[PDB]
Design an enzyme around this catalytic site. Structure first.
Site, mmCIF file in Angstrom:
data_model
loop_
_atom_site.group_PDB
_atom_site.id
_atom_site.type_symbol
_atom_site.label_atom_id
_atom_site.label_comp_id
_atom_site.label_asym_id
_atom_site.label_seq_id
_atom_site.Cartn_x
_atom_site.Cartn_y
_atom_site.Cartn_z
ATOM 1 N N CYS A 112 -10.792 6.435 -8.213
ATOM 2 C CA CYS A 112 -10.057 7.669 -8.155
ATOM 3 C C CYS A 112 -10.740 8.647 -7.212
ATOM 4 O O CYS A 112 -11.954 8.809 -7.364
ATOM 5 C CB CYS A 112 -10.029 8.240 -9.505
ATOM 6 S SG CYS A 112 -8.782 7.287 -10.360
ATOM 7 N N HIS A 123 -0.376 -6.375 -17.764
ATOM 8 C CA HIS A 123 -1.323 -7.369 -18.254
ATOM 9 C C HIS A 123 -0.649 -8.493 -19.057
ATOM 10 O O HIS A 123 -1.227 -9.586 -19.041
ATOM 11 C CB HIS A 123 -2.430 -6.697 -19.155
ATOM 12 C CG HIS A 123 -1.868 -6.234 -20.496
ATOM 13 N ND1 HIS A 123 -0.974 -5.271 -20.777
ATOM 14 C CD2 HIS A 123 -2.146 -6.885 -21.664
ATOM 15 C CE1 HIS A 123 -0.676 -5.311 -22.053
ATOM 16 N NE2 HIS A 123 -1.397 -6.300 -22.572
HETATM 17 C C1 LIG Z 1 1.757 -2.100 -20.512
HETATM 18 C C2 LIG Z 1 1.305 -2.190 -21.989
HETATM 19 N N1 LIG Z 1 0.009 -2.021 -22.325
HETATM 20 C C3 LIG Z 1 -0.485 -2.199 -23.543
HETATM 21 C C4 LIG Z 1 0.400 -2.519 -24.649
HETATM 22 C C5 LIG Z 1 -0.179 -2.617 -26.069
HETATM 23 O O1 LIG Z 1 -0.725 -3.836 -26.403
HETATM 24 P P1 LIG Z 1 -1.993 -4.397 -26.299
HETATM 25 O O2 LIG Z 1 -2.705 -3.624 -27.384
HETATM 26 O O3 LIG Z 1 -1.846 -5.474 -26.781
HETATM 27 O O4 LIG Z 1 -2.934 -4.743 -25.308
HETATM 28 C C6 LIG Z 1 1.745 -2.698 -24.398
HETATM 29 C C7 LIG Z 1 2.615 -3.412 -25.430
HETATM 30 N N2 LIG Z 1 3.064 -4.736 -25.527
HETATM 31 C C8 LIG Z 1 4.053 -5.363 -26.446
HETATM 32 C C9 LIG Z 1 4.304 -4.656 -27.684
HETATM 33 O O5 LIG Z 1 5.370 -3.668 -27.807
HETATM 34 C C10 LIG Z 1 5.464 -5.705 -25.795
HETATM 35 O O6 LIG Z 1 6.170 -6.466 -26.303
HETATM 36 O O7 LIG Z 1 5.987 -5.038 -24.895
HETATM 37 C C11 LIG Z 1 2.259 -2.484 -23.049
HETATM 38 O O8 LIG Z 1 3.615 -2.373 -22.917
#
Ligand SMILES: Cc1ncc(COP(=O)(O)O)c(CN[C@@H](CO)C(=O)O)c1O
Ligand SMILES: Cc1ncc(COP(=O)(O)O)c(CN[C@@H](CO)C(=O)O)c1O
Ligand SMILES: O=P(O)(O)OCCCc1c[nH]c2ccccc12
Ligand SMILES: O=P(O)(O)OCCCc1c[nH]c2ccccc12
Ligand code: NA
Ligand code: NA
Lengths: 389, 262, 389, 262
Positions: free
Chosen positions: C60, C84
């Protein structure tokens, strides 16, 4: 002019005399930046660590089944912002601040060059105003607000026909006042010299990464590289490092619209007359008495009624072939790339893909290594494609 | 060619300045545009600057853009312009007519063919708004061949090389730009250098509003002043009261031409 | 069990007995795939050439001005699909076809794991059904149709509370029937063993690329790496290669919602009680009598009322700290990253960024090298953020 | 513990099979759930299987999910369930009561504390739907400590190691699964192996609809058959005609129990 403004007979600088010092200043800035190691160092750093270059070269494993066509895709859709537009915009904003400038003007039709100007300005500390026309604002509302959130002014053209054509004009009018503070970040490899050369040198990496990638993968250069042509930057980005490898065919694809015969198309290079507009002499769509006629395409990003001069030139000497693809054949290749490969392409890039699928389908026993330039992702387009049911 | 020489030469003795109105051919209709140009002349216009409707006026801001839109609704093509132009000349044999053009309209059916119908119709000069001195060669060579005066713009940000070029190439008059931007009724050192190079009678550019601006321009060194913005706004305003339009027109031209001494 | 199911006391496999052979089969598949060079070769190829890995590490240059905080961003937003989620989904679909399976079930809340299952299926020839709940369908309609176009079935849950919680349940019910043909592509690093381990091993590259990148750039390891925690995959993806570098702080950020004290939050690990649900023993949000209480967040992707077991464990031994961030502080860091750096973050990743901005703002003379995991792009979110005016 | 031994032992002499209805405690209201369980008993139910309302029924398809939703609208908490359970036992001292539970409800205030109130209220067995044999240890150890029979499921896809485990751990009866999926009123080799290992009286699982299915189950080797789906649909249907509900209930239990020989 340090560099020549013409590509055979196409080119030049047909601008009001007041803008002429501005163009020669930019040409000086470009030439000195091209030799400055600190410019290329800053440029490369911003391409690798902010934008995410090199982009991948994906082999298709399912769409070519039953034919002898191997098809790769150059993944410009994976660039920050979601399209090839970003590469050039980073180079021109470093040119703008190298010339001590502080405002940026730009025009946009699919909204994608709008968004890339909005992001490079916010990154570099420049202020930014954009012109966009009414049916594009509608067709591409995703991009309208991405652009807005990054603090860019969308000045919503409807001074006459409200389209890219109209935005282009409005942007040149404003820069005729502003040119001593403001830089005009023009969107394609068209308009007055040196913008055809600068936009090509700043999109050149697309084609030089493809050449390195395919040679490592296939051990050999493509039989053809295919790219869509709205005004010509992604296509000249792609074609540029291959022009001297005669073996390699270069195919540019223009919007066929409702089909050439309807008159509702956007294919100037193969169905227009040379004319003079937007600061250049190049094929365009004009009335018999010379009014600039508007074009059509289901994709906002290819709705421009002229084409960049280096393309009009590559065609006349027969180094490149230009072909056309209707709305419906682009829509069909959009559907098919999702469903068999899990990549949602921008409707502009689908025109290049529908032409490579035609080549493969018409002659299934022809062994051929192709590369399409998948110039953008189709997230701006999903609302629009869904409303065609 | 010639009509300009006489005008500036006789204006010279009158110790007057030229007042050239600018009007788009066709706005709002053929017959009524033609009555506007006779009312202008009969009110004191020394020469005319006429624009033919182009779809994409790069150097024209909004009034003139609306003006173009107006002739376009009226149906005025390039050819009906030329038809009006031969009619103007047929009844006003002496007033210099200059055409304000955009490049594609000239290029369409051949540059030389365009200058040829200009000569045939009795037009004196052509200014192509988007062809800078460095791209002018086929345009200026075709105009000289048909005794059409090639008009060039000399902008605020002009340097020597340019000033000597436009002095060597232009004929009729020099359009001297007094501002930057695109046309609208909103928004000295160069003149001497022009007169040193022996350039044509500089008339002043965009941004003339004041009756006294003409006066200023004239004593500042300019031989006259061009106005379009103003003229058109009135056509836009009193468009419902045609007689009143004609009347206020007759007023400003008289009013501006009356200010043309200082 | 070849691998242990527990992280200290959190974990296990609390599933109906019928699903137990399915879980041990998947554990066998995972372990043998982990040792198979042709599995890692196929996996790596698909990550580099289809998804576009390595993703960049952006410094940044404007948001940290006036403080002594250097802030980098790991660019997961630049992965194919836009988040991700894609990394794990490629590994599990190769496991699914290695086990001769042919349907895929999945659940989604922000829609982003829905879209990544839809794309990997279309790529690999698997058929795919997804469960998604009503307010998420609404909040994330972008993703609803990207998913639909690639030919995936969105089965729109509203069996009770219609949310990820409800989708999760519906997905386990269906897989209790289908388990001999169908594989369940579970979305986070939570649920029954071995899914906490498999999803972590398939997201591990995030943190191993960060380690290599920062050491080359800074010559030194971060002071802290920060990531948001919905159920925990991107965070454990990030944290995983750093756990043994004690110097490095690991901060997980949970949705604070309208603020913890309102009760409308989504922060189980620091404001819930351990419970047993979704096949695991882990902190969750439940009534005093043990009903599973629903959570809240402005971002659909972090609206889950429990958290993955390896996180509950990293907290109890104090190797990782978990913090909370309200809706409004996430919204403020969304605005600020657009406007000063030209990156539009997903509202989930904004929670991790708002916590790194807090750290920088509270103590401006503290010299600190941070890394936030910018886990997704905010294109799904722009309609939603615009309607907060 | 004991009530089951007597039931299967006396059913044995009657050469009858057991018919255990399943009902959610609280659906649709306390008083009216209590009248449903007396009508069931008085119609021929050999034992009861009762479910306490859980918010997230992982193993329960739609009728039972709606059933839960119903007790939840009725206000039936865990504690009002236990309050109903001590009332059922206070007036039906002999019928075996088994509880169908989900794990969090048992874990909430301590596993052992849960088995303790079960013992205090006079419940005989507890089946925890989502705790497989491999995670059962604190649950089965706490139940044995309070003379509560730990019930286990033996699914279609069972292998030897599992069959010997559930035979060594369970008590009261064995829940033998006759299908896959989640509960609904839609959609032999194992039994011998169970009887070889000396496992508890296998009662049959999900997917019992047919009166003759009971018959089949009984001669196939199963000591009885459990039904919930059916029972609940009626509660859902005739919910507006309460007396008619009771009546059709009284009919199916009589009808199903009547089929319990073969
Ligand atoms: C870009 C991004 N970053 C992080 C997360 C949260 O999940 P993580 O805790 O698993 O890493 C989500 C959600 N991912 C799931 C749950 O709702 C999905 O089906 O869309 C996301 O949309
Ligand atoms: C992904 C993508 N690919 C290609 C093009 C066409 O332009 P190109 O011919 O310049 O390369 C566009 C349009 N780009 C311009 C014009 O409308 C913009 O402002 O959005 C695009 O959106
Ligand atoms: O400022 P105004 O409106 O008075 O116009 C100026 C007059 C001539 C004129 C009209 N339109 C043009 C386009 C380019 C160059 C000159 C012109
Ligand atoms: O097929 P049905 O509806 O007759 O139910 C089967 C009876 C007991 C039962 C009800 N819900 C459960 C959840 C998990 C395991 C067993 C059960
Ligand atoms: Na075009
Ligand atoms: Na959570």
């Amino acid at each position: 002019t340090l560099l020549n403004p013409y590509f055979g007979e196409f080119g030049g600088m047909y601008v009001p005399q007041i803008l002429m010092p501005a163009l020669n200043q930019l040409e000086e800035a470009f030439v000195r930046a091209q030799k400055d190691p600190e410019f290329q160092a800053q440029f490369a750093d911003l391409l690798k660590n902010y934008a995410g270059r090199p982009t991948a070269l994906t082999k298709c494993q399912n769409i070519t089944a039953g034919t002898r066509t191997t098809l790769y895709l150059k993944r410009e859709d994976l660039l920050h912002g979601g399209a090839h537009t970003t590469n050039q915009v980073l180079g021109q904003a470093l040119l703008a601040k190298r010339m001590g400038k502080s405002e940026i003007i730009a025009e946009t039709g699919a909204g994608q060059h709008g968004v890339a100007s909005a992001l490079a300005s916010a990154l570099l500390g420049l202020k930014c105003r954009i012109y966009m026309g009414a049916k594009d604002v509608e067709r591409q509302s995703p991009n309208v607000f991405r652009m807005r959130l990054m603090g860019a002014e969308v000045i919503p053209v409807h001074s006459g026909s409200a389209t890219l054509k109209d935005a282009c004009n409005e942007a040149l009018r404003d820069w005729s006042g502003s040119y001593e503070t403001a830089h005009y970040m023009l969107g394609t490899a068209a308009g007055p010299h040196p913008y055809p050369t600068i936009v090509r040198e700043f999109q050149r990496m697309i084609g030089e990464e493809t050449k390195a990638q395919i040679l490592d993968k296939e051990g050999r250069l493509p039989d053809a590289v295919i790219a869509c042509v709205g005004g010509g930057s992604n296509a000249i980005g792609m074609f540029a490092d291959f022009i001297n490898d005669t073996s390699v065919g270069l195919i540019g694809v223009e919007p066929g619209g409702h089909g050439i015969e309807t008159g509702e198309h956007g294919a100037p290079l193969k169905h227009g007359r040379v004319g003079i507009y937007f600061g250049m002499k190049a094929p365009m769509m004009q009335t018999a008495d010379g009014q600039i006629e508007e074009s059509y395409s289901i994709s906002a990003g290819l709705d421009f009624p002229s084409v960049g001069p280096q393309h009009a030139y590559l065609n006349s000497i027969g180094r490149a072939d230009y072909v056309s693809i209707t709305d419906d054949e682009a829509l069909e290749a959009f559907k098919t790339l999702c469903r068999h490969e899990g990549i949602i392409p921008a409707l502009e890039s689908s025109h290049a893909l529908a032409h490579a699928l035609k080549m493969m389908r018409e002659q299934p026993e022809k062994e051929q290594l192709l590369v399409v330039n998948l110039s953008g992702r189709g997230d701006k387009d999903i609302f629009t494609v869904h409303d065609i049911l | 060619m010639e009509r300009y020489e006489n005008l500036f030469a006789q204006l010279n003795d009158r110790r007057e300045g030229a007042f050239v109105p600018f009007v788009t051919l066709g706005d709002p209709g053929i017959e009524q545009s033609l009555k506007i140009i006779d009312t202008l002349i009969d009110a004191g216009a020394d020469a005319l600057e006429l624009g033919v409707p182009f779809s994409d006026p790069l150097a024209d801001g909004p009034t003139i853009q609306n003006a173009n839109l107006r002739a376009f609704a009226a149906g005025v093509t390039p050819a009906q312009c030329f038809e009006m132009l031969a009619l103007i000349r047929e009844k006003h044999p002496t007033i210099p007519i200059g055409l304000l053009m955009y490049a594609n309209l000239v290029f369409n059916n051949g540059i030389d063919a365009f200058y040829a119908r200009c000569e045939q119709v009795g037009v004196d000069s052509v200014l192509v708004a988007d062809v800078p001195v460095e791209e002018s060669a086929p345009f200026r060579q075709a105009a000289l061949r048909h005794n059409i005066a090639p008009i060039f713009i000399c902008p605020p940000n002009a340097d020597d090389d340019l000033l000597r070029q436009v002095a060597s190439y232009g004929r009729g008059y020099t359009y001297l730009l007094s501002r930057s931007g695109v046309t609208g009724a909103e928004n000295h050192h160069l003149i001497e250098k022009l007169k040193e190079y022996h350039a044509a009678p500089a008339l002043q550019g965009f941004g003339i509003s004041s009756p006294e601006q003409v006066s200023a321009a004239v004593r500042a060194g300019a031989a006259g002043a061009i106005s379009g913005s103003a003229i058109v706004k009135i056509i836009e305003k009193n468009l419902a009261s045609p007689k009143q339009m004609l009347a206020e027109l007759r007023s400003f031209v008289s009013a501006m031409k009356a200010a043309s001494r200082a």
